[PDB]
Coordinates of all heavy atoms in Angstrom, one line a residue:
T247 N 160.9 78.7 149.0 CA 160.3 79.2 147.8 C 158.8 79.7 148.0 O 158.4 80.7 147.3 CB 160.2 78.2 146.7 OG1 160.0 76.8 147.4 CG2 161.4 78.2 145.9
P248 N 158.0 79.3 149.0 CA 156.8 80.0 149.4 C 157.0 81.4 149.9 O 156.2 82.3 149.6 CB 156.2 79.2 150.5 CG 156.5 77.8 150.1 CD 157.9 77.9 149.6
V249 N 158.2 81.7 150.6 CA 158.5 83.1 151.0 C 158.7 83.9 149.8 O 158.2 85.1 149.7 CB 159.7 83.0 151.9 CG1 160.3 84.4 152.2 CG2 159.3 82.4 153.3
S250 N 159.5 83.4 148.8 CA 159.8 84.1 147.6 C 158.5 84.4 146.8 O 158.4 85.5 146.3 CB 160.7 83.4 146.7 OG 162.0 83.2 147.5
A251 N 157.7 83.4 146.7 CA 156.3 83.6 146.0 C 155.6 84.7 146.7 O 155.0 85.6 146.0 CB 155.6 82.2 145.9
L252 N 155.4 84.6 148.1 CA 154.6 85.6 148.8 C 155.1 87.0 148.6 O 154.4 87.9 148.3 CB 154.7 85.2 150.3 CG 153.4 85.5 151.1 CD1 152.2 84.9 150.5 CD2 153.6 84.9 152.5
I253 N 156.5 87.2 148.7 CA 157.2 88.5 148.6 C 157.0 89.0 147.2 O 156.7 90.2 147.0 CB 158.6 88.4 149.1 CG1 158.7 88.3 150.6 CG2 159.4 89.6 148.7 CD1 160.1 88.1 151.2
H254 N 157.4 88.2 146.2 CA 157.5 88.7 144.9 C 156.2 88.8 144.1 O 156.1 89.4 143.1 CB 158.4 87.8 144.1 CG 159.9 87.9 144.5 ND1 160.9 88.1 143.6 CD2 160.4 87.7 145.7 CE1 162.1 88.1 144.3 NE2 161.8 87.8 145.6
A255 N 155.1 88.2 144.6 CA 153.8 88.2 143.9 C 152.7 88.8 144.8 O 152.1 89.8 144.4 CB 153.4 86.8 143.5
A256 N 152.5 88.3 146.0 CA 151.4 88.7 146.7 C 151.6 90.1 147.5 O 150.8 91.0 147.2 CB 151.0 87.7 147.8
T257 N 152.6 90.2 148.3 CA 152.5 91.3 149.3 C 153.5 92.4 149.1 O 153.2 93.5 148.8 CB 152.7 90.7 150.6 OG1 153.9 90.0 150.7 CG2 151.6 89.7 151.0
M258 N 154.9 92.0 149.1 CA 155.8 93.0 149.5 C 156.2 94.0 148.3 O 156.2 95.2 148.5 CB 157.1 92.4 150.0 CG 158.0 93.4 150.8 SD 159.5 92.6 151.2 CE 160.3 94.0 152.1
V259 N 156.5 93.5 147.1 CA 156.9 94.3 146.0 C 155.7 95.1 145.4 O 156.0 96.1 144.7 CB 157.6 93.5 144.9 CG1 158.9 92.9 145.4 CG2 156.7 92.4 144.4
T260 N 154.5 94.7 145.7 CA 153.4 95.4 145.2 C 153.0 96.6 146.2 O 152.0 97.3 145.9 CB 152.2 94.5 145.1 OG1 151.8 94.0 146.4 CG2 152.5 93.3 144.2
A261 N 153.7 96.8 147.3 CA 153.3 97.9 148.2 C 153.7 99.3 147.6 O 153.0 100.2 147.9 CB 154.0 97.6 149.6
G262 N 154.9 99.4 147.0 CA 155.2 100.6 146.4 C 154.3 101.1 145.3 O 153.9 102.3 145.2
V263 N 153.8 100.1 144.4 CA 152.8 100.4 143.4 C 151.5 100.9 144.0 O 150.9 101.9 143.5 CB 152.6 99.3 142.5 CG1 151.8 99.6 141.3 CG2 154.0 98.8 142.0
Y264 N 151.1 100.2 145.1 CA 149.8 100.6 145.8 C 150.0 102.0 146.4 O 149.1 102.8 146.5 CB 149.5 99.6 146.9 CG 148.3 100.1 147.8 CD1 147.0 100.1 147.3 CD2 148.6 100.5 149.0 CE1 146.0 100.5 148.1 CE2 147.6 101.0 149.8 CZ 146.3 101.0 149.3 OH 145.2 101.4 150.1
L265 N 151.3 102.3 146.9 CA 151.5 103.6 147.6 C 151.4 104.7 146.5 O 150.8 105.8 146.8 CB 152.8 103.6 148.3 CG 153.1 105.0 149.0 CD1 152.1 105.2 150.0 CD2 154.5 104.9 149.5
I266 N 152.0 104.5 145.4 CA 152.0 105.5 144.3 C 150.5 105.7 143.7 O 150.1 106.8 143.6 CB 152.9 105.2 143.2 CG1 154.4 105.0 143.7 CG2 152.9 106.3 142.0 CD1 154.9 106.2 144.3
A267 N 149.8 104.6 143.6 CA 148.4 104.6 143.0 C 147.5 105.3 144.0 O 146.5 105.9 143.6 CB 148.0 103.3 142.6
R268 N 147.6 104.9 145.3 CA 146.7 105.5 146.4 C 146.9 107.0 146.5 O 146.0 107.7 146.7 CB 146.9 104.8 147.7 CG 146.2 105.3 148.9 CD 144.7 105.3 148.7 NE 144.1 103.9 148.7 CZ 142.9 103.6 148.3 NH1 142.1 104.5 147.9 NH2 142.5 102.4 148.5
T269 N 148.1 107.5 146.5 CA 148.5 108.9 146.6 C 148.6 109.6 145.3 O 149.4 110.5 145.1 CB 149.8 109.1 147.4 OG1 150.9 108.4 146.7 CG2 149.7 108.4 148.7
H270 N 147.8 109.1 144.3 CA 147.9 109.7 143.0 C 147.4 111.2 142.9 O 147.8 111.9 142.0 CB 147.1 108.9 142.0 CG 145.6 108.9 142.1 ND1 144.9 108.1 143.0 CD2 144.7 109.8 141.6 CE1 143.6 108.4 142.9 NE2 143.5 109.4 142.1
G271 N 146.5 111.6 143.8 CA 146.1 113.0 143.8 C 147.2 113.9 144.1 O 147.2 115.1 143.6
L272 N 148.2 113.5 145.0 CA 149.3 114.3 145.3 C 150.3 114.3 144.1 O 151.0 115.3 143.9 CB 150.0 113.9 146.6 CG 149.1 113.8 147.8 CD1 149.8 113.3 148.9 CD2 148.5 115.2 148.1
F273 N 150.5 113.1 143.5 CA 151.5 113.1 142.4 C 151.0 113.8 141.1 O 151.9 114.3 140.4 CB 151.7 111.6 142.0 CG 152.7 110.9 143.0 CD1 152.4 110.1 144.0 CD2 154.1 111.1 142.7 CE1 153.3 109.5 144.8 CE2 155.0 110.5 143.5 CZ 154.6 109.7 144.5
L274 N 149.7 113.9 140.9 CA 149.2 114.7 139.7 C 149.5 116.1 139.9 O 149.5 116.8 138.9 CB 147.7 114.4 139.5 CG 147.4 113.0 139.0 CD1 145.8 112.8 139.0 CD2 148.0 112.8 137.6
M275 N 149.7 116.7 141.1 CA 150.0 118.1 141.3 C 151.5 118.3 141.1 O 151.8 119.5 141.2 CB 149.5 118.5 142.7 CG 148.0 118.2 142.9 SD 147.5 118.8 144.5 CE 148.0 120.5 144.3

């Protein structure tokens, strides 16, 4: 369950949101 907490909250599933938000200048075009 610490693995699930880490993946689902801290690190892994938030990577795609960070990728979209970081590259927002390309997505707005």
Side-chain angles (χ1 to χ4, degrees):
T247 36
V249 169
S250 300
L252 213 55
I253 287 179
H254 293 233
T257 60
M258 198 190 181
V259 296
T260 65
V263 185
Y264 172 77
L265 182 63
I266 303 299
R268 173 60 73 190
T269 60
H270 70 271
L272 305 176
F273 275 99
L274 288 172
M275 307 184 51

